[PDB]
Design a protein around this ligand. Structure first.
Ligand code: NA
Ligand code: NA
Lengths: 85, 103, 85, 101, 85, 85, 101, 103
């Protein structure tokens, strides 16, 4: 009762390698692979959500910074080169 | 034909930061990034809806890639068709510095 | 026919977040999550196999290098400090 | 701008629909709506993708999450009128990529 | 042996590296950089895997025959046909 | 702004970084180091997640009562009982 | 050296067996064989694990893939006779860790 | 009581490499790594089977961790019980330098 069963469709190539891993004794069952893979996916998903939150934070900073203006890249080059000291 | 294109104060700061960071050791590379970013912005002024919508960031946000940078911008009005009065580039983000899943 | 169905047991906590992701419109079905997760797991597995091959390579180099001898760490310190120039 | 698809790209689209449609037809339809909408945007804005000459010299990438459209313009120029866009592949990043960029 | 180089990092990165060293996670910042660059070597190999995969898929597409317009209404009907043998 | 530091990497790492720059993947080695250190920041956060998780689990174990020897024969019988309500 | 297990570690062992045993009893038995064998090795060699004072000051980790035994010695010294080993948790790295080390 | 402990020529080279790499900027850290590695090896001479078997590497291989390093070694005879005549440390591996899934 500490598991929840679900029917899932993987690609034939994926199912093949999952069977290979079990037959090699790397895992006892395909479910063990899916549990490990989904835990990793949870962490990956959180890193992706971090990215979205970071982009939103950066966006919000830009929108709060004042009146937007055109940029002259020739002028900008000179300003940046001066910041280089 | 080209719409008005403006940059947030923070986006201007992003551009200066980018140039100074790489220019501190390779000024030719700094110049090339400015050549590329200016070219991409000029394209955008001509075709204001070329960036993909990213409403998961904020509702009007659009993203245009100029590797390794991501330009975040919006059009005003925020419409899918019809006249655009300006494009505002809100940030220039270096994916190597700020993103997990890209660059 | 370009998929293979299997019944798998995930943890209740995992099943919950998978449902949350689908309900949020991040994925259409749980199968899409498993396919993505298993592809990532395939790559992770190959990095782990790389590690085992690398450890084996390093081991084999050590075994091929000649007669093993005791090490005096006080002496070894002096030799290493000389290599520092 | 004329929009055409390689025979393999058409096969990609069919495979995508069949894979998800095998359990959720509504989702399969939604993907076609999204892919068609992006392909239409691309025909209006042929250089909206990213150049990837490290793949092949004319290659460009346009994301339509979770998919990536690999395409080229003809001519393969940076400026001026485009005569057509060819979508060469439709790739599912969940199945075939470590990262998008 | 060892190769020294002068590198430019962000102030934010330098601050966290110093924090980690001061906390005893690492002995010096170079230890962090070596770990980080080794991980980047693997990331780069996975990136090259992606590029090769996309190139392979591209080449297959370019060799598959004359490109044609797609009618998505007709395409949907054809995909549903495929689903039913 | 920018922070310069002198770091020591391996000759093998330095060689691949030079290869990548010469091939046009990057403009300078510092660009690689910045990307790599940013990825390490995320790795370190995942490492801290692991440490926190292990600490949480540890603390729970230490607060659960008097430790006792385990008979694995008896334990197996008890686990099989659990499997059947 | 006396070997004891926290009540939670015993619960960990039961949960592990129930989880895999729900579909493969032979595998569940194999895991118990492996965990018992490692716990016996640990009783003979109490300091074979790695110290992890960054977790808690007396904490040690011993891998028994895919599991990690969290344990301590009493006394918590680096040398000299150990009176007992307490296994505090049995952790499945596949379910609870990004990395082992 | 302690069994004979020897190191492959390559393992000795590993030890020198480790010290020189970190010692090039922090000699106290180099010394501490030697203190720790010597201590772990002394333990191993007293308890030759404290390393976990890793037959997936090679059949007799054992691994003993001394973070961030992994000691790879074997006993001879390669038995689970009975007298050991020596321990050979075959490599000292820095996980930060050579492993994907550890350190
Ligand atoms: Na990045
Ligand atoms: Na590592």
């Amino acid at each position: 009762a500490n598991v929840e069963k679900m029917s899932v469709a993987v690609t034939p190539q994926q199912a093949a390698v999952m069977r290979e891993a079990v037959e090699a004794g790397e895992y006892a069952t395909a479910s063990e692979i899916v549990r490990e893979a989904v835990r990793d996916w949870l962490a990956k998903r959180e890193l992706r959500h971090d990215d979205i939150r970071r982009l939103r934070q950066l966006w919000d900073e830009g929108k709060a910074s004042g009146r937007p203006e055109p940029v002259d890249f020739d002028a900008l080059r000179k300003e940046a080169r001066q910041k280089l000291t | 034909m080209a719409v008005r294109l403006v940059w947030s104060p923070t986006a201007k700061a992003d551009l200066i930061d980018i140039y100074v960071m790489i220019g501190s050791e390779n000024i030719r590379a700094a110049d090339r990034y400015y050549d590329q970013l200016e070219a991409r912005a000029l394209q955008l002024a001509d075709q204001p809806r070329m960036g993909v919508r990213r409403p998961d960031i904020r509702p009007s946000a659009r993203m245009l890639v100029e590797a390794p940078f991501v330009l975040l911008y919006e059009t005003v009005p925020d419409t899918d068709d019809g006249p655009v009065e300006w494009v505002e580039i809100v940030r220039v983000v270096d994916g190597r510095r700020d993103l997990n899943r890209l660059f």
